[PDB]
Each structure stands twice: as structure tokens, then as C-alpha cells.
């Protein structure tokens, strides 16, 4: 009757520009795919399905999650599909997971998400048919189809400044929290505290092989002093800035989900139970309460309150976002995104729900906390969330 | 277990490549569907719990095509949406997805269907990030890229499909003469006010004026096997597949309502076709075509249902070659098998086809009287998806 | 001494999108360039240098004016090179020839221009290092390199609304202007006055041929009604108008420039002595001026005055260029573009100067008028201007 | 009358991507003409024409030359136009100012060259009318209209081992050639030769200010052991490599040419008389010959024998040229190419030959040679060369 998640592995988060800037998305969740069948030993043809999220699928090929299947080593046999509800996109492939195995279309499914910012392409609407006379515009990708809002064409961080004003969001208080997330990232980081859950990808270059194996888009450095410096980003009088939000990231994370009894049969070890699902929409402008609804519905279905959840691991699209939700839900601060968040590790789009379904995984094994909840505010006005209880042993 | 029924399945008329759709984005073709069905069959507007649309070529499309659906089509900002990528089975996988959202409790009535436009698919840039350094570049085709030319082998489709043409046998002349029985037989059903029902017309502004876009248009209703034997072979020297016994590159959007039967019934919808079985498949990418057999299996097997049982088998035509081999492997009898013509006469807007063909048979059971049909797309990268449907007696 | 411009060609000018989209301006030349070889059986061996005007150089390949020379026919041991000022490239090409002639670089040059506004590509400045992130532009080459000034990024059209107000050059005059460049051009073509100086060309399309043999940019029922009725292309309350200006249009034109003892010689028949050249530059922001200082340095190097030319051939860059230059220099308007200009035929950017030389030299001939000038204003703050002659 | 060139000058040479990476070829003229006003103290009301030399067009903006003048201090009433003779422009703009100035059409012309080859765009020629279905090419504008021949599409490099193979230049010959241009190049950059012919150019960046000075395309490290190594650049079994040929580079030179009654007039200095021009043509798969007929023409017009010429500066398009032209002449290896070329200081095409006539300008006057001739093999099968007399006091 349960659906639990195993085996969930990430790859570490590669900086905009940075060593993972030549290695396509689907080659990143193909990697953690292989890598988690050799560690299981799960038999390749128990897979039912295999459902990714990617946001920028602008030049990945044909059908992402079918190139993360076959080549991460699955039978041709295995179906595949793609899932984009931007931000939310990772861990919508894990509630699709949920739905096809609670509605028996499947039994056992690999779940995650996939990006990389700097492999989206740009993009000529005039090329096909012709721009006829005067100048044309190449579009950047990751801001069409992943950053800016669909229907004002705002980036997402604009948008984010109306979220500021109405909740009243100081600068200070969002570089507060950024450097916060910052100093916690770095401490759990320096003790070992994302070893289990990262797996090392090897980057071959030029006359060169680089084994990527530690998150490398933190900033342990960081000060509130320092943030207090950076200009605004998105508005003249703002107070979003590169310090607050965080990077354009490429990464990927994948886990097995099934029933507690298919997990036990296969000899897998789950490590959470799937208690409660939200998801929610409000509007385009203030998409970053998206989490409050989607949050509030997750708990319902788990028959939790606020005080009954040991971590809340809320995206960090912005430090304004974590604090609105945080507030907004009477949140205690050392319970909200206890071991830092985007902010320091990176936001690779259509992987951001896995990597953190992820984190709190491994979080609550080595805690022996019970009770989580990862939510994600996504962009157009959306929220996703999932209530998840560890699982003992 | 409640019956999840289909209801007010609505598609517009489908466009040419360069044709009346060829400005209209992919997600102002299903917002328009979404409109046209909520303005007709009355539904409140907040009992919608999702809308999930299918849609391949995404690059350009901006933020979230689903999304982009729901709001323009009136939805209020509260309805959650998502797009879902199963390419040439994406606009059926979007029901699929409903089914399984209805059944696991996320949602009691969703808005599921599928958009494409071909013509919009963008030019991509890979080395302009970054820069060229020196040298020649490429700027890639997104529909061969992203929609087209299989992800392992850079390979057209329709080269992969060659070698489904060599293991089967097809013949050009049974191709052929596949292809001209699909344009004789929609033309035939179209001229009879068959599609009349099931189509929603788009108003088109440009410079000079509107166009009331209230037909198919991709179709060539005098095509003959006399004809079709001229053409050469478009993707290998010595090959079979045409331009004439292969669909365009085409554009438009289907949506419809996925509920429980009590949901339909208590919110005065008119269910069209209760969903017995569904069945996604894999197979070898190279031989994709294929794919429809074993998806059909799985869907037929959950219905409890026989071959025989079937009153119409609606199978995409990617190719004629595909037609051939799925009708003639299940043994389907040929006046069975695509009735009403396919996608060779009317398009196949990869995203939008799989729910194009869900809408064309709930509509073909209501006139008919039939009971129970198969729809059923064979999908690039060696996938199938099929549904078993039964006509709801209204 | 004198220098003698003979066997003066040209191809049909092609529309914006029309016959010639799909044909090089290279190829143009090159095609000019065989057919004059062959109509006037000169010794290929003859010819010293090919020099060829173009503008948008821009995806043309390595040096336009070589391959003119080389896909026409020429031997390889013929040198050439390409000569860029703008709008007056076509003329500045037999300016190049006539300098290399008196100083005793060469004896016999083919000379002319070359242009094809369709084949110019677009530029991408940002690809070669990256826009890293944003939007980035892809600008039209014929804008950049073609039709804005290089100092204020503005279009020829929008600078020449400036010309306009300082001149008063009413909107009423401009169209008038335009419309009778239309009429003159449309019934000098029905009169078969142009067969003599055009060169067909065959385009070779899907399994099928045009022969292409007839200007087609021009538009013979324009009136002075219908224009009144067209919005103003480059200010708001402006008075330019997409029809009292010329198209975006193709072609080529080339002749043999030599001395009239090396034409004798070689058994051609000269049609015009060069008897003075004028090159000026004023203000960039009043290019359609150019035409005056330049015309009036002609003019004193052949040691004549307005009144002793029976035409004037002055390139309607636009209406508005043609009546400030026209009536600044006094012009009886029946002596002023006879037979229609580039409002009527097209404005081939760096070919137009050579189309007007080749126009003038088979007009005297039909007319056995004695004496024109050739001039064209030039984008940058530019004039060229040729005084010349008739040959019996 | 004798024809004089005065007041040549230069700008420092730079690097593929290196510090002029970011300035227009039109503003490195416009520069070379502004400190020539200057020093000179020539009246601008004197100057009748500028003639610039640049190969790369695309995206300069309307006629180069007229931008070099304008920027450059000149009044609006100087006309200009830009030459293009591929690799001989930078000769071709002092050709054509000869003629003027001989015709009578002209007293006094600033002539040169100006080339920035990263500073050449990319091309799409499908954009405007439309690519319709299928991928595309984006041109490098370097390639298409700079460095691949017309006829062939193939490079000049490519067509050139043709040219080794006909005259069976050694690899060993070419790297040897190499070599010694670098350390000829070194030694007189080192004895201070090129700082009379060099104007600084300072370079505005994000960063401040760069006052390039000196030219930093050159390899004084350069072994023939080290240039062994090399891979060849154009054919697999070639000769050819990034060692034995220049690279891509950005500059400006120009210079004032007039009678020499003219120059004295008004208070120039002449450097060198023009005794003879030689313009001629070859098979363009054999290009790198075209000096050897173009030298005889310019010679014969002198009246000159080979042995009366004191240096030779033909241009090091690639070693394999240098050493078909010396050779083809019985040109002595002391007395061709005696401060380097092209290989050691870059070859910015359409500056190159204005670079030459200004190096051998300053070289006679350092030297007292009486006799020079500059010569450079041009792309389609064309050379252009001038004989040249150095002018006292």
C-alpha cells in the first residue's frame, strides 16, 4: 500500500561555465541511473518505466528520459517519458511515479530530473521561414523556455520583486538568509554530510579526465557584509542580487519508486514513504507562495500539522521565496532547509525536486528524523510538494 | 474501480507545414480548444483539478506549454498544469497520465490533450552560447533534432523506418496503394460532414484580415496509386517511403475531459468512451513502427478483450509502411483498420496526433454506434502507446 | 590620350525576392562579362585588369571582382580587385580604370559593379566568442554595410528627411518626381530603348528555365494619386515613402575602358570619351548633396557648363535626391533622367553607377545627343560624377 | 615626377583574440590617421582621398575607409573608398593613390590598411529568406571571404601544399624558414628597429585602460625542434602547420603618398620613391607564386636587376611561400625578409601589405639601403609587388 522511495543518488552540482558546462543532461541522469542499477544490483527488466524532468529540451534529442534510460544501461524494453512542470519538474516525475504504480499501470519506476543551463541552445524564431529585412533576435534559451514568465516575459526574478513588496521582504533579511545557507552548506559539506548521496562523474577533456565528485557552485566565503555590496539584479530599486539567488546549474538525481512490499521482495532499502502530495497554482506573479497551498495540501493528505515536520526543505529560487514561505507557515528557522539550499549548491532546473527528494533522504537516515517535506515554488505560478516520513532499517 | 470516461473531446482543424496554423503557436492552438470546451459543455470553471497537454517540440514554446494552455484558454490561475513528452504518443500519453492521476486520488477531473506546430519549431544554436571560435557552424532544424531523427543514431525516422520496410516486406506498391485508400477514405468522410462534430474552428489575424479556419487542409483528396508510384524516395536512394505515403509536417491541438463516470455524470457532462485498458510499450529505436503491436497487446489483454472484438483499430499512419505491418501482425481486417482515413491525408502534429485520434474515434463510436476501438501511435526512439475504448450508450 | 569607355552592358535589374534572389552578384558580373567577351570578339589576353564595384561584400566569397573575371571567361593571368565607395562603386570602377589607364598601369581594363540586395547575409557578431547569456541580435548585412550611416546607425531614408526640410523638397514634388521617373521608364522600355544596352540571363530553377530579359522592378501604372496615398517609410511625419525611393534590387554592368587609339586598335567601337570625373564628399548627414560639389568638378575638368549638356543621368537615390540636385544646378527637368531612373528601374547599390554609364552610353547613341553627366550621391557624405562625350 | 610615400606608420600587431580583440579594423585606421595628422602637422585641407585596404567587409559598417577618414580628424569634405585585392589591399590602397596621384585626379592620399579577423562576423546566409526544413550553416566570415579560395571552397593553407609539393619544399626547409623569422623578428624587436614605425594604441576595457605598445603575435622561444612537433594544419600527410604560417591578427598602417615637390611643399619628410609597380595573376591554386611575376613587373618598370635590391619583404603567408619566391629569384637569404615576417609579427590581411611598404620605410632609413622591394602572393592567384628607393635626410 506504501510507495517509498530507494536508492535516491545525485550527481554533485556543476557551476554556470563550470565542469560540467559539456555534458548534455541526459548524459548526467544516464550516469546516476547506471550508477544506481551497479549498486542496487536491481534486475535491469523489474524497471516498469523511467519518468524525467527537463525543463530546457530545446536540442537534448528525441525524448529525454528515453536517452537517460537506454543509455544509463536499461533494457530497450523500458519505457520512457519526459515531464516538465518547470521548477517542480524532479519531483513531478517522482508524484507521475506515484500515480502510475497507486493506479497499476506500473509496479517499479526510476524517477528523477536533468539539466544543464549552459548546454541550452539559443534559439532563431525568423531562420525557418526567413527574417526578410531589418535585424532579427537569437533568444536565449534557458531565459525563453526556463527563466522569464510565459505571459509578461519578465524573468522570474522581476516577477520575485512584487513577492518582496508584498510580504515585505528587507534586503537584509534575504541576505541573512543567504549567507545562512551559505555557512550551513559549507559545515555539512566539510563533514562528509552529502558523501552518501552524491555519485562522481567523470569529465574527459582535451588530453585530460577530471573525476567531478564535491558540489563546486558554493560560496563558503560568504558574508552578510559582502552580500550588502552586490547591485540589484532585476529591478533599479530592488533587492534580489547574484548573492541572494542562486547560479544557472547543471545536475541530475534519480531514485527508485514502488510499494514498501516490491521494495522488501527486491531487496532494496527504502528510505521514505510517500505520506502526502500537493500541488497548487496561483498567480504567474507571485508564483513563489506556490509552496504555501502545495504544502498545506501535502500535509492534509499525511494528517500532519506544521510543528509535526522535523525539516521542511523548500527550494531556494530566491532567499525572498524560503523567507515568505518559512513565515508565511510559522516555520521554526532550524527546522527550514537545516543543512542550506540552492543558494549555495545550485538550482539545475528540471533536477532541483530530485536533488532535494535526495537530500532529505539521506538527511533523515543520518538524523533519524521522521518526518519532511520537500516543496518546490515553480515558475507560472505553481507549487509541488511531497510529505515523506523516513523509513527505519 | 469507477470508469474513467473521455468527454467533449474537441480538436481544431489541422494545418499544413506553411500553412493557415503556421503563425499560431502550439499553446494559442490548445487554449483555443480549452476556451471553445468550457464555453460549450458549461463546466465550472474551478472543478478542473490539471490540465496536462502533450507537446515534442518545446524549444521556443516558452515557460510551460500546459500552463500557457490553461491560462490563455480561461482557466483561473488556481488549476494547476503540466506538458508531458512521450513524442509522437504524447497528446494520448496526456490521457494516460489523467487516468492515473484519477485513479491514485491526485485528481477527480482533468484537462488532458496535446499541441504542436511544426512551422513555429525554432532554429537552435548550440555553439552560440559559448561561440564558434573559428570556423563553419550549425544551426539545427528543432524538428529534426528534437521531434524527427532518433536520439541514438541522428537518423530520420523515415530511414529507420526503411528497415522496418525490409523485415516486413512492404512493398512501394502496398505502400502506395495504403496511402491512396487513407486520402480516398477521409476525403470520403470529410465531404460527409463526418468530422463536422468533432472540429472547432480558429479565427487566423493577418495583415489582411481574418481567416475562419473551420477545415482540414493537409489532405489531397485526388491522390491515386497512379500518382503516388511518380514520386521518389525521400530518405534513403534505394527506399519505399515518399512524401506522398508519409503524413506532413503539420499543427494543431485536441483536448478533452478525463473523469470518473460519476464526476462526468454529476457536473452534466456527456461521457463519449470509457477507457478498458491502456498499454505503453518498448522496442529496438530502429524499429519504432513496430511499437503498436506490443502496446496494443498489453491495452487489449487489460480490457479482456479479443482482436476480433474490435470494432475500428486507430493506428497513427506515420507511414504507410507502419499501417501495413501493425494491421497485418495483429491480423486486423483492412476495413477495420483506420476507417475513416489517417494521418497521411489529414497530418500528424506529433503532440497533438495521439489525442487527435482519441477525439476522432469518440466521435466515429457516437455516429457508428460501434462499442469498442483501439487507438494506438508507434513513437520515435522505439516506444508505443494504446488505449481500448468503449462507446458510454448517452 | 582621350579614355573611351566601349561595348557598355547590362543585365535586366532584378525586384526585391524576384528573378535574381537566388543568383550571385558574381554570377551577374560574370555572365556581363563573357557575353561582352563574346559580342565584341576582344582578345582575352587584351584585358590588363577586371575592377569591379560592390557593396555588401559580405558571404560574396574572396575578392567578388575575380571571380567575375575568372567565372567570365578570363584568364587566369588577369589580376582584379573590388573598389567599395558606397552607392558610386559602379561609376568609381571606371574612375579606378581611367587612373590606371593615365598613369600607364594598364592599356585595356573591364570596369563596372556588381550588387544582388537579396544575397545579402545576416551577420552574427556575437557567435565567433559567445553572448554567454541574454538575447543577442542578428543584424541585416544590407543595413550595416548597405544602407546606414556609419556614424549614426540611421537608414540613407532617415537622414534624407533632413535634405528634405532644408531644401523644402515637398512631399507633392516627391511623388511627382517619382511618378514621372515611372511613366518615362515604362514608355521608353515599350519603346524597345533599352534592348541594346540589357543582356538577357538564363536561371536555371527546379527541372525548368526563365530567361530573364526585361527590367521588372518598375511599375508603369503608378500615379501621382496613388502615391499620395503611401505612409512615410523612415520618420513619422516624413515625406519618403517606399514609392517615391527604389527598391532592394540586383544586377551588373561592365564595359571596356581604354584609350580610343587601344579601342581602334582592337577593331571596338567607343560609344563615350571620358572628358572629366568629379569626386566630392560633404556632410554624412547630407549625402544627397554630393551630386553638386561633384558634378561642378566634372564639369571644370571638361571646361563645360550645365547649359552645354544635353542630360543629365543623376541616380534617384530617392525623388528628394533628384529634385535638390536638379534644381541647385539649374536643370532644364526635360534633361534631367530622360528616360526614368532607379525610382522606375532599381537601385542594384554597386552596380547602379556602371547601369547608368552603360544607359547613357546606348541613349547618346539612339539620340546622337553630344554631351551628358553621370552622377550618383553616395551614403557617407559622398559624389562621383562623369562628364562624356558621344563617339561617332 | 616622383612619386614619394611619407610619415608611414603602424599600430602594434595583435593576437588571434588578443588585446585588439575588441576594436573595429575601421577604429585601428582611424587611430594609424589621427597620429600621422598630428605628428606631421599636415593641413587636412591637403589630403584630396583616403584609400583603405580591408578584406573582411562584413559588419565594419558603410565603407570602411570613409569611417578610417572621419574618425581619423579629417574633415567631412576628404573622400575615401575601400580597396580589396585580398592579402595585397594594404599594397593595392598605395597603388591605387600612384594612380590618382599620376592621372592628376589627386595631390595627396593617405593610403593603408585595417583588418581585425576576430572582429569578423559569422554569416547566415539562409536567414533571410529562410532555411524551410532541415539544418543549416552559419559561416565564418574569416573563412568564406578571407582565407578559402572562391573557386574551391578549400583553404589557402590546403592550396598552398600544393605549391610545397610542385617545388618540393621540405617540412625541415619551412620549419628551418620559421625559425629564423621568429629570431630575426626578436632581435630586431630587442635593438629597438620597430619602435619609429609603431604608434600606441591604448585600449579602454571593463577592467581600465591597456596602452599596447609593442606587437605580441611573436614566438621568440621558437625552435626548429620545437616547430618539428607541430601537427600539419591542412592535409594529413602535409607540411603546413600553425608554426610555419601566421596567425589570424588585427592591425592598421598608413602612410601619405604625393610628389616628392608636394611632400617638400609642405614640410613632409619623404622615405621612399616609387620606382615600380608590378600587378599579376597565376592559377589560384598556386597563388603563393604570384610574387615572382608581379616582382618582374615591378623591377622591369625600375629598371632594376634582382642582385641590385638591397632587401626583399614578401610576405611569410606561409614559410613554403618565402621560400618559393627567395628561391624562384636567387634571392640571398641575408638580404629576404632580414627583420622577419609575417610568421613572427601576424599577417592582418588587409593591413599586411601598408605594413610592409612602412617597415622597409623605416629599415632603409636606419640602414642607408637604397634599394627595397615589397611583394605578397594574394589569395585567388594575384601578386602585387613595388620597387622601392629610399629618399635622403
Known amino acids: 500500500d506504501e510507495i517509498v522511495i530507494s536508492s535516491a543518488l545525485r550527481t554533485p552540482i556543476g557551476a554556470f561555465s563550470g565542469t560540467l558546462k559539456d555534458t548534455p543532461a541526459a548524459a548526467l541522469g544516464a550516469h546516476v ?42 533494457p530497450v524494453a523500458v519505457p520512457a517519458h519526459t515531464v516538465n512542470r518547470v521548477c517542480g519538474s524532479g519531483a513531478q516525475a517522482v508524484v507521475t511515479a506515484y500515480a502510475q504504480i497507486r493506479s497499476g499501470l506500473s509496479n517499479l519506476v526510476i524517477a528523477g530530473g ?8 539559443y534559439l532563431m524564431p525568423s531562420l525557418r521561414h526567413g527574417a526578410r529585412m531589418g535585424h532579427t533576435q537569437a533568444l536565449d534559451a534557458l531565459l525563453r523556455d526556463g527563466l522569464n514568465d510565459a505571459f509578461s516575459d519578465q524573468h522570474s526574478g522581476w516577477h520575485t520583486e ?21 555557512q550551513r552548506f559549507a559545515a555539512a559539506q566539510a563533514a562528509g554530510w552529502f558523501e552518501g548521496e552524491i555519485v562522481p562523474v567523470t569529465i574527459t577533456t582535451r588530453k585530460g579526465e577530471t ?28 533587492t534580489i542580487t547574484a548573492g541572494n539567488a542562486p547560479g544557472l546549474n547543471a545536475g541530475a538525481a534519480a531514485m527508485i519508486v514502488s510499494s514498501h512490499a516490491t521494495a522488501t521482495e527486491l531487496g532494496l532499502q527504502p528510505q521514505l514513504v510517500i505520506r502526502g502530495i500537493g500541488v497548487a497554482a496561483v498567480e504567474p506573479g507571485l508564483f513563489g507562495f506556490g509552496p504555501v ?101
Open 114 to 121: 536533468v539539466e544543464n543551463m549552459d548546454q541550452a541552445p
Open 162 to 182: 512584487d513577492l518582496v513588496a508584498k510580504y515585505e521582504v528587507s534586503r537584509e533579511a534575504q541576505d541573512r538568509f543567504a549567507a545562512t545557507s551559505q
Open 211 to 238: 573525476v567531478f565528485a564535491k558540489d563546486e557552485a558554493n560560496r563558503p566565503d560568504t558574508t552578510e557584509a559582502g552580500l550588502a555590496k552586490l547591485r540589484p539584479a532585476f529591478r533599479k530599486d530592488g
Open 33 to 74: 541511473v547506471k550508477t544506481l542499477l551497479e549498486r542496487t544490483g536491481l534486475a535491469p527488466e523489474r524497471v516498469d518505466e523511467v519518468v524525467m524532468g527537463n525543463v530546457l529540451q530545446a536540442g537534448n534529442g528525441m525524448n529525454v528520459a528515453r536517452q537517460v534510460a537506454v543509455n544509463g544501461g536499461l
Open 293 to 393: 497551498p502545495a504544502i498545506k495540501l501535502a500535509l492534509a493528505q499525511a494528517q500532519w500539522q506544521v510543528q509535526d515536520v522535523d525539516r521542511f526543505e523548500v527550494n531556494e529560487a530566491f532567499a525572498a521565496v524560503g523567507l515568505v514561505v518559512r513565515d508565511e507557515l510559522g516555520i521554526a528557522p532550524e527546522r527550514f532547509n537545516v543543512d542550506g539550499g540552492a543558494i549555495a549548491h545550485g538550482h539545475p532546473i528540471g533536477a532541483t525536486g530530485a536533488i532535494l527528494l535526495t537530500k532529505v533522504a539521506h538527511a533523515l537516515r543520518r538524523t533519524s528524523e521522521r518526518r519532511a517535506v520537500v516543496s518546490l515554488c515553480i515558475g507560472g505560478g505553481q507549487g509541488i510538494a511531497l510529505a515523506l516520513e523516513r523509513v527505519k532499517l
